[PDB]
Design an enzyme around this catalytic site. Structure first.
Site, PDB file in Angstrom:
ATOM      1  N   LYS A  43       1.392  13.720   8.782  1.00 38.75           N
ATOM      2  CA  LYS A  43       0.723  12.424   8.769  1.00 38.75           C
ATOM      3  C   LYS A  43      -0.453  12.447   9.748  1.00 38.75           C
ATOM      4  O   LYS A  43      -0.288  12.761  10.929  1.00 38.75           O
ATOM      5  CB  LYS A  43       1.688  11.270   9.087  1.00 38.75           C
ATOM      6  CG  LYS A  43       1.062   9.912   8.861  1.00 38.75           C
ATOM      7  CD  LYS A  43       1.986   8.773   9.189  1.00 38.75           C
ATOM      8  CE  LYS A  43       1.310   7.502   8.734  1.00 38.75           C
ATOM      9  NZ  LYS A  43       2.044   6.290   9.168  1.00 38.75           N
ATOM     10  N   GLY A  96      -3.232   5.509   7.332  1.00 39.72           N
ATOM     11  CA  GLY A  96      -2.514   6.782   7.203  1.00 39.72           C
ATOM     12  C   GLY A  96      -3.053   7.736   6.135  1.00 39.72           C
ATOM     13  O   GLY A  96      -4.148   7.529   5.581  1.00 39.72           O
ATOM     14  N   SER A  97      -2.304   8.841   5.907  1.00 34.83           N
ATOM     15  CA  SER A  97      -2.516   9.956   4.947  1.00 34.83           C
ATOM     16  C   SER A  97      -1.466  11.031   5.250  1.00 34.83           C
ATOM     17  O   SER A  97      -1.307  11.449   6.406  1.00 34.83           O
ATOM     18  CB  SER A  97      -3.925  10.553   5.014  1.00 34.83           C
ATOM     19  OG  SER A  97      -4.059  11.728   4.222  1.00 34.83           O
ATOM     20  N   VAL A  98      -0.727  11.446   4.216  1.00 38.31           N
ATOM     21  CA  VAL A  98       0.357  12.419   4.361  1.00 38.31           C
ATOM     22  C   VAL A  98       0.113  13.602   3.456  1.00 38.31           C
ATOM     23  O   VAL A  98      -0.147  13.427   2.267  1.00 38.31           O
ATOM     24  CB  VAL A  98       1.759  11.771   4.198  1.00 38.31           C
ATOM     25  CG1 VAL A  98       2.869  12.805   4.278  1.00 38.31           C
ATOM     26  CG2 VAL A  98       1.977  10.684   5.249  1.00 38.31           C
ATOM     27  N   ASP A 107       7.605  -3.417   7.323  1.00 35.20           N
ATOM     28  CA  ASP A 107       7.034  -2.886   6.082  1.00 35.20           C
ATOM     29  C   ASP A 107       8.100  -2.216   5.210  1.00 35.20           C
ATOM     30  O   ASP A 107       7.906  -1.097   4.731  1.00 35.20           O
ATOM     31  CB  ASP A 107       5.875  -1.921   6.418  1.00 35.20           C
ATOM     32  CG  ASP A 107       4.916  -1.522   5.321  1.00 35.20           C
ATOM     33  OD1 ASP A 107       4.758  -2.292   4.359  1.00 35.20           O
ATOM     34  OD2 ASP A 107       4.305  -0.461   5.443  1.00 35.20           O
ATOM     35  N   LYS A 131      -1.794   8.613   0.278  1.00 37.03           N
ATOM     36  CA  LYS A 131      -2.936   7.995   0.949  1.00 37.03           C
ATOM     37  C   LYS A 131      -2.602   6.602   1.444  1.00 37.03           C
ATOM     38  O   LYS A 131      -1.568   6.025   1.113  1.00 37.03           O
ATOM     39  CB  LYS A 131      -4.166   7.954   0.010  1.00 37.03           C
ATOM     40  N   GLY A 132      -3.491   6.085   2.262  1.00 43.26           N
ATOM     41  CA  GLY A 132      -3.380   4.746   2.824  1.00 43.26           C
ATOM     42  C   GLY A 132      -4.669   4.366   3.509  1.00 43.26           C
ATOM     43  O   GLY A 132      -5.536   5.228   3.711  1.00 43.26           O
ATOM     44  N   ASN A 133      -4.802   3.069   3.870  1.00 49.80           N
ATOM     45  CA  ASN A 133      -5.982   2.552   4.567  1.00 49.80           C
ATOM     46  C   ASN A 133      -6.139   3.210   5.937  1.00 49.80           C
ATOM     47  O   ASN A 133      -7.266   3.577   6.311  1.00 49.80           O
ATOM     48  CB  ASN A 133      -5.930   1.021   4.692  1.00 49.80           C
ATOM     49  CG  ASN A 133      -6.406   0.279   3.455  1.00 49.80           C
ATOM     50  OD1 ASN A 133      -7.455  -0.378   3.465  1.00 49.80           O
ATOM     51  ND2 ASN A 133      -5.641   0.345   2.367  1.00 49.80           N
TER      52      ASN A 133
HETATM   53  N1  LIG Z   1       8.133  13.210   4.586  1.00 44.72           N
HETATM   54  C1  LIG Z   1       7.874  13.643   3.326  1.00 44.72           C
HETATM   55  O1  LIG Z   1       8.340  14.698   2.891  1.00 44.72           O
HETATM   56  C2  LIG Z   1       7.019  12.789   2.434  1.00 44.72           C
HETATM   57  C3  LIG Z   1       6.273  11.739   2.989  1.00 44.72           C
HETATM   58  C4  LIG Z   1       5.484  10.913   2.179  1.00 44.72           C
HETATM   59  C5  LIG Z   1       4.753   9.756   2.743  1.00 44.72           C
HETATM   60  C6  LIG Z   1       5.194   9.101   3.889  1.00 44.72           C
HETATM   61  C7  LIG Z   1       4.481   8.052   4.434  1.00 44.72           C
HETATM   62  C8  LIG Z   1       3.306   7.631   3.831  1.00 44.72           C
HETATM   63 CL1  LIG Z   1       2.349   6.402   4.595  1.00 44.72          CL
HETATM   64  C9  LIG Z   1       2.872   8.251   2.666  1.00 44.72           C
HETATM   65 CL2  LIG Z   1       1.450   7.702   1.841  1.00 44.72          CL
HETATM   66  C10 LIG Z   1       3.584   9.306   2.131  1.00 44.72           C
HETATM   67  C11 LIG Z   1       5.417  11.184   0.814  1.00 44.72           C
HETATM   68  C12 LIG Z   1       6.111  12.244   0.244  1.00 44.72           C
HETATM   69  C13 LIG Z   1       6.950  13.042   1.044  1.00 44.72           C
HETATM   70  N2  LIG Z   1       7.512  14.033   0.264  1.00 44.72           N
HETATM   71  C14 LIG Z   1       7.025  13.909  -1.025  1.00 44.72           C
HETATM   72  C15 LIG Z   1       7.267  14.704  -2.147  1.00 44.72           C
HETATM   73  C16 LIG Z   1       6.601  14.401  -3.326  1.00 44.72           C
HETATM   74  C17 LIG Z   1       5.708  13.327  -3.398  1.00 44.72           C
HETATM   75  C18 LIG Z   1       5.053  12.898  -4.674  1.00 44.72           C
HETATM   76  O2  LIG Z   1       5.403  11.858  -5.210  1.00 44.72           O
HETATM   77  N3  LIG Z   1       4.137  13.709  -5.239  1.00 44.72           N
HETATM   78  C19 LIG Z   1       3.562  14.923  -4.644  1.00 44.72           C
HETATM   79  C20 LIG Z   1       3.895  16.106  -5.508  1.00 44.72           C
HETATM   80  O3  LIG Z   1       3.432  15.918  -6.847  1.00 44.72           O
HETATM   81  C21 LIG Z   1       4.030  14.751  -7.426  1.00 44.72           C
HETATM   82  C22 LIG Z   1       3.707  13.514  -6.630  1.00 44.72           C
HETATM   83  C23 LIG Z   1       5.470  12.549  -2.269  1.00 44.72           C
HETATM   84  C24 LIG Z   1       6.136  12.819  -1.079  1.00 44.72           C
END
Ligand SMILES: NC(=O)c1cc(-c2ccc(Cl)c(Cl)c2)cc2c1[nH]c1ccc(C(=O)N3CCOCC3)cc12
Length: 287
Positions: free
Chosen positions: A41, A20-22, A132, A16-18
């Site tokens: 995103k 964004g959101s992925v 950033d 999450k973000g202010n």
């Molecule tokens: N491009 C990607 O694959 C990707 C992109 C983002 C991202 C990019 C920009 C922004 Cl602004 C934000 Cl907020 C997020 C985050 C993740 C990505 N893969 C991930 C795999 C696992 C997890 C993670 O920690 N989890 C989820 C599963 O359960 C345990 C907790 C998080 C991410």
């Protein structure tokens, strides 16, 4: 390759973000569950300013092709624009470093550092200012590869200038910001270098909650200080050469890299090419 909304199956929320959101999705056009898992995103609250910004961000990523830069896959329209990127299974370097504290040594942190420098130098070649750099914005492909994972604040330099002035309404990552970014809103390759030193600091603290740049700076400024006063005292702290401490166990040669990035004189900050050489030289000595 153009993605159709009807075949983008929602799996889970990645972050999450202010603005964004992925999300983690499955692009399954054949409905046989042979479709690829992707990261999507989307704008949390879509406005015209956020939309135009997002279209500029999509073009920035589309134009980047590097091993240490998350791959762009495409877009998904209705209007309600979605950025499709590759799924990186291990998530942010921030969250990954904590889970494998015991498993990740200084030599490995320096591998990640090196890769970050390579990706950052690739950005400079395109005259893109990240604005950033934080471990939260670095993603893990596997144990031996990290990529810069978000470009939400990335700005293209004017052809004639070496800085870019911007004051984005809302909450800024002030504890990763160079002094000139705090006082004048000037963003350059040199403010990205300052933020890189904060990234290198983050790595060597192993993301220990008490040791974070906000926690360490708020302790230095005073936890009593609130609102617009925090930015003011941070400016004064940095001006009086108040700096983040050496992380526990960090070798003096790695801390020197940090402090050199944290120079108040924008022009005496290292380059990403010189940072890469140094990190690689230190890696080779350790090996
Ligand atoms: N491009 C990607 O694959 C990707 C992109 C983002 C991202 C990019 C920009 C922004 Cl602004 C934000 Cl907020 C997020 C985050 C993740 C990505 N893969 C991930 C795999 C696992 C997890 C993670 O920690 N989890 C989820 C599963 O359960 C345990 C907790 C998080 C991410």
């Amino acid at each position: 390759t153009q993605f159709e909304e009807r075949h983008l199956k929602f799996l889970q929320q990645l972050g999450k973000g202010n603005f964004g959101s992925v999300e983690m999705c499955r692009y399954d056009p054949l409905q046989d569950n042979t479709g690829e898992v992707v990261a999507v995103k989307k704008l949390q609250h879509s406005t015209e300013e956020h939309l135009r910004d997002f279209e500029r961000e999509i073009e920035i990523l589309k134009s980047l092709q590097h091993d240490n830069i998350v791959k762009y896959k495409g877009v998904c329209y209705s209007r309600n624009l979605k950025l499709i990127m590759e799924y990186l299974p291990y998530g942010s370097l921030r969250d990954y470093l904590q889970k494998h504290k015991e498993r990740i040594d200084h030599i490995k942190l320096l591998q990640y550092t090196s890769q970050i420098c390579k990706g950052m130098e690739y950005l400079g070649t395109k005259r893109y200012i990240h604005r950033d750099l934080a471990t939260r914005n670095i993603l893990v492909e596997n144990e031996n590869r990290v990529k810069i994972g978000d470009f939400g604040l990335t700005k293209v330099l004017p052809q004639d200038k070496e800085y870019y002035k911007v004051k984005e309404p809302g909450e800024s990552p002030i504890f990763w910001y160079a002094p000139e970014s705090l006082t004048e809103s000037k963003f350059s390759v040199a403010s990205d270098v300052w933020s890189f030193g904060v990234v290198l600091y983050e790595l060597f603290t192993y993301i220990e909650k008490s040791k974070s740049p906000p926690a360490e700076f708020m302790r230095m400024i005073g936890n009593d200080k609130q609102g617009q006063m925090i930015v003011f005292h941070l400016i004064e702290l940095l001006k009086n050469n108040g700096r983040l401490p050496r992380p526990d166990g960090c070798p003096d040669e790695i801390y020197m890299i940090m402090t050199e990035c944290w120079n108040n004189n924008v022009n005496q900050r290292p380059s990403f090419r010189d940072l890469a050489l140094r990190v690689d030289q230190i890696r080779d000595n350790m090996a």
